Structure formats: structure tokens, C-alpha cells
Amino acid sequence: GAMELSMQGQLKLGCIPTIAPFLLCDLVQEINQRFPQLNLLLREDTTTNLLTALRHGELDVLILALPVEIDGMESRVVGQDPFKMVISRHQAGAIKVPIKYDDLPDESVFLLEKEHSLTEHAVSACKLTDKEKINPFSATSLHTLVQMVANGLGTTFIPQMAIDHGLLDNQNLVVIEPPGQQAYRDIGLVWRPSSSRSKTFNQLAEVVSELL
Template sequence: MTVLPTLRQLRYLVAVAETRHFGRAAEDCNVTQSTLSAGIQELEAVLGVTLIDRSNRQMALTVLAEDLVLRARALLQAAEELVEAAKIGKQPLSGLLRLGVIPTIGPYMLPPLLRPLRIAFPQLRLYLREDQTARLLDLLGRAKLDAAIIALPYETGGLSRMVLGEDRLFIACPAGHRFAARASIDVDELIGERLLLLEDGHCLRNHAVTACRLVPGKANEDLQGTSLGTLVQMVASGLGLTFLPEMALAVEARAESDVVAVAIDNGEPRRQIALVWRPGSTRVRDMQLLGEALRLRKAATDGGGEGGGDLPGARVDSAPSLSIQG
């Protein structure tokens, strides 16, 4: 009978490959460095190959190990999905669900959803990871996340996705600006205005540039914000104008903020909000339920109400735990 490597040994190998450091890999696996090193040596003995190049002081994977890491990661993901499938079969949207969300959506879309979600699915433990789209999709591809809420258009490869709705873009200007009393403006009127954008990596920056046909020189590259809140503070200080998605208006352009949001003509630039997940995931049913819950919440918010309708599969019980990582 062929002796097979254990999942623990494969996890050690993947951790070493991802951290390129024995100490950090041991921390990620919650074991001592000596335990991890012994596990790697046992794996080498089982496979009959060398995985770690120990000819110099700097740790390096062999060429063969780089290929085996991809296979090991797939096996670990399949094992995790097997366990999740067993849990999900008992009750939908239960257990740990790791959801990524981009910073221009999370603070505005999720808060009104969380309470109805925990009422509907009391056994759900929701872990939120806020990050830029590229990093979220990387984590999703490596099975570090179960799903992510992002804005389209964005290249998502072969990921499955559900479009949750559209989000119009507005221009935010100081209360004393010539646009402030207008119901809407034309895109061409932005020529000559100082436009403030999010720093590189935020998809809202690309959406604004594309939708409003901006060209280099129209935006102020010296004043870039790390968040919509930062940009709004710049606008309130008279440093320029910025773009705000509709879902952020109630928070970022409220009456006391000294910032006014004005609609944009010329096709009303907008982005699509979508839930994405890995194809073939055992949690497809959960993704569909979560997507429908998000759609209902957005519809209630768009309708101007506080949105208290029942979510799919709703039942009242104790609240799930919530973990947030920025």
C-alpha cells in the first residue's frame, strides 16, 4: 500500500511556500518551528524527494516543491470543502464564512445588512476582510476567503458571480462651489476642475476615470486619498472635487458635512456591485442565499426605507459572531 502524506504535512509545506520563512510558517500553523521542520522532513521521506534546498543559509524551495505546493494547496482546499459540505448540509449559511469586501462598498452597504442577516441565519459566523480588489481576488483564489463583494467592471477570470445591483457615481463638491446649487452637471464641465481620486489600486478610481472619460492631467495626482472619507475631507477643505458612489452619499455627503453631491449627466456613470466566489465551491447554495440577502437589502435602501424585510430562510434566534479585519 502506498504511504500517503498527511494533510498536516501538506499544510506545513504550503505555509513555508507562502511565507518563505520557517518561523512565520510555524506561527501560521500554530506549531513550534521544530515541529514544522520535522513535519517537512517527514513529508520529504514519504515522497522520497527534497523539498527544501538546505545548501545555503537562505531557505528556498526546490523546483519540484514549487509544483507540489500547487497540488498540496488544491488537496487542502478540497479537504476543507468536504468538511464545509457536511456542515452546510445540516443548515444553510452556518459556520464560518469569510467574506471579502472593498473599502468603497463595505462601510456603506454592509452595516444595515448585518442585523437582518444574523436574525435570519443565527448559526453564521461572519468574518469580514476589507481590502482592495486585487488582493481580495488573490485571497479568494488561494481559498483564504469564501466570497468577495467587489465592483465591476473588473477582470474576475473564471470566478462565479452574482450582480447585486448598480451604483451611480456623483460629483462631490464644497457647499460654496458653483456646482452645489445644480441638480446635475455635464461631464465636460469637469474640465479645468481639480479632481481628487483614490490612490492606485482602488477600482473606483478606474471606474471614475473610464466612465467620465478623464485623461491624464484632469486629476490631481499630488492629492490622492486612501479612503472616500479622506477625499471628502479634502473636498470640504476646498482642495477640489471627487467622485462618490450613490451608496456612500448618506454617510459622506450628509447636510452637516459641508459637501454637496451632484448628479452627472452623459449616461449617468455607474458601477455594478457583485458577489464573486470560486467555481465549483461546495457553498454555492450559501452564496446564492447571501447574494439574495444583499439584493433585498440594497432594494430596501434604494426604496428609501430602513429595510426590515425578512431574508431568505429567515428565523429568529441568537446572533452569530462577527469578526472584522481591515
Template structure:
């Protein structure tokens, strides 16, 4: 077995298509197919069931997938230990959730480049489940997500507390003047992100305590910016994190905000790495830069929504 064969096999197992897997690893489909055939020949077993429009792993393939991911993760950890042996230098692959990325990254990346123009920072924006998977498999060095981390074997460095405000048009907010806690917001007026976005889960469960309540919630918006544009024009209400206030109020001048009573609903945002990866100071340095960038955004939002 070779590392190339294992990486091609993992790509195939995840993409469930020879064509998609080949594009993911930047080779031609015949080249990937040949490597998989050689891997099967070397092992003496069939790893993949080749179907007309799909592929399925055999039992042997499922066993190999688990081991291959662990091997590739260990290799990534070894590479990272060398790249980051002098702190935050070389190349860093960072994943960020969509409700943080467009607000935090512009400020943070500017600070990172100012600190070290040679730093090769590679950013991936995706939902929490995919980022945690990519971090665990070694495709990312660290991720920025909201706690708790939904997987063991991870180390989290809290960055900041991000409070939620009620957002909508002036007329909509006037209609719910008495709503001083998230649970008092009428569900038939509440708009949230698509299912799968962590902000939807946080708002409904941790923030609103609505996990066991009957729900009539429109989960049709795919981005927080789209959602803010809708509610600014009177199409319901939503919860807006402080970190997004500066950007979204500038983009939608009609958007109005109101703070909830204490204790204000919030989420804790953290920088997360694998526990198995070596930390020679790079995580602390990266966390300080991210925390500083977030502090500027939160300071701007400090007085937003206050009566």
C-alpha cells in the first residue's frame, strides 16, 4: 500500500464517485481507478462495489477506510509538527463556520499577514459537522466553531462570547415589544438558517430553549446576510450574533436590533485542534490574533440594540 493509494481510496469513499473523487485529488479518473485496482490487487480483496451510478464499500473497504483515515491523520500531525515547530509559521489550514467567517476573517487575515507576510494561511468555510470531520482526518490544522465540540479527542481554546440580539424591521420589533427573552419571541415570526447550520441549533436549543416546543419556523435562508436582508424588509424576526452587527447593519440600513434581558443569550466561540497534534505555541498565537480581531467587532456592537 502507498500513501497515494490510501488518499485516493478515502476520497473515493467520501465522494462515492470515481469522477468526483478524481477531481478532489486533482488526477484523471483513469489514474484514480488504476490506483484503486492496484490497491485491491495488493490486498487480495475487493474494496468497492462498482454500481451504475454509485459505489459502495465492501466490508473489507469499510475496515480499510477507518484505518486509512487514522494513518493519513497521523501523517498530517507529523507534517504539522514540522511546519509549526517555531510557532505560527509556514502553512496553516483553518476552518471557520459560515456564521463567523465573513465577519471575523477579513480582520483576522489582515492581522496575520501584517504579523508575517510569508505565512501561508488556507481557509475553509463549512458547517460544523464537516469542519470537525476534516479536522479529525487531518485535512485542517484548526477550526473556529461554537462550543461544545461534538467529538472527543479535541482541544478547545475559547476565544470570545458572542451574544445574540433580536433583529427585524422597526414595525416587527414594535409588535413584540414585550419579548424580553428568546423564548417569548412568537415562533410564527421567527426565521432561522437552513437546518445543519449550528446557529439554527444554538438558537432553538441552547439560546431559546425551544427543543421540546411545537415549532413553526422557516428554515429557508442559506446565509446570515440573506436572513438579515429579509427581516430588515419586514419578513419576520431573527437572532443576530454581535460579531455580525457591524457588517449586517451597514448592508441593511433598515435593520433594527433589540437586546434581550440579562442573562443575554450567547454562544462561546473557540479555536479547536486535535489533541494528538503538537502545539509549540502556534495555537496560542493564532488564538490571540483571532481574539483581537473579534474584540474590535464586539466593541462596535456593545451599544447596539439598547433602549
């Protein structure tokens, strides 16, 4: 017979669509080795939907792009994810590099719709103030946005983590720097101040910081 005997157990983690396909692959491989008893249940959803689930205790922690409105939650920024622009190789002549927005054709910049934090962050960080350059047809996923650019329709902003995870493979695209300063989005972890798992969240934040 036999005697009866913080990174252990289960965590529900939410993440936005322009981070989840890229960073979480790396996170899972790292936790598999470093914290092998941590089971990560995952939810992918829009920022607003994730925040409601977090408030309601249906998720334990989120990985978001910041800043977004998160009053009342606790957050920790863990790294920065640069922005690049992309154009098709076939269009690399009709678009001059360095990019100057005023020299692009009207309606040549394609962006995700507003439920997506990528648009507010890229437009502000990359200083796109001329609304006439934005195409009126809004994209609904980062993959289909990049495919429209690959079809030669114009240009857009892409996060570095997507490039590093092969999003552009086999689509014959060229990666360019956005005009002006080096531009980026902050990545952070967000959780409830009342949570009893903040030791877990801070260890997780250290792990994620090493992947960015």
C-alpha cells in the first residue's frame, strides 16, 4: 500500500487574434518544458469580449496589445512588438521606398475593422493621419488582409511577431519600415486585482517577456 500524499494546475488565458496564432505557439513550447504541470486552456477573442470574460471570471488572465481601456484591471507590459509595412513584390515599383504616406495613392492602405486593436495601434504608432489613403473596404482577419496585399491591392501594417512566424511565406511580399520613428505596440498581461493567482501571473509575465 502507500501513504496518502503556483505554476501547477489549470489556467484560462485569453488572447487577441493578432497575437494568439504567433506568440502562443512559443509560449506553449516554453511552458511544456519549464512548467510541465501547467495546463493552459486558451480563448481567442476581440479585446472587448476578452475583457468582459475576464471581469466575469470566465478567464484568469489575458495577453493583450496595449494601450486599450482596462480600468479596474491590473496589467503588466512585457515587451514591444514592432510594426512593419508590407507590399507585394509586383507592386514594389508603383510604391516608393522609403514610404511617404502623401505619395501613396488614395485608398491604398488596407486596415482591419475597429473591433481589432491592430488598426488603432498601427495608425497611431506609425503616424498615419491622412484618412484619404485608407481603403474603404475593411479587412476582417490579418490573414485575409495580407492576402489582399499579396494580390497587389495596396499596403498595410503587420506586427513583427507575425513575420517571425511565417505569415508572409510563399506570398511574394516585401517588408518595409513604416515612415518616421521606429513604431511598435506594447504587449501586456491583464488580470483581476482580486485574483489569488498573481504569483502565477507574474511568473507567466517573465516567460512571455523572454519571447519578445
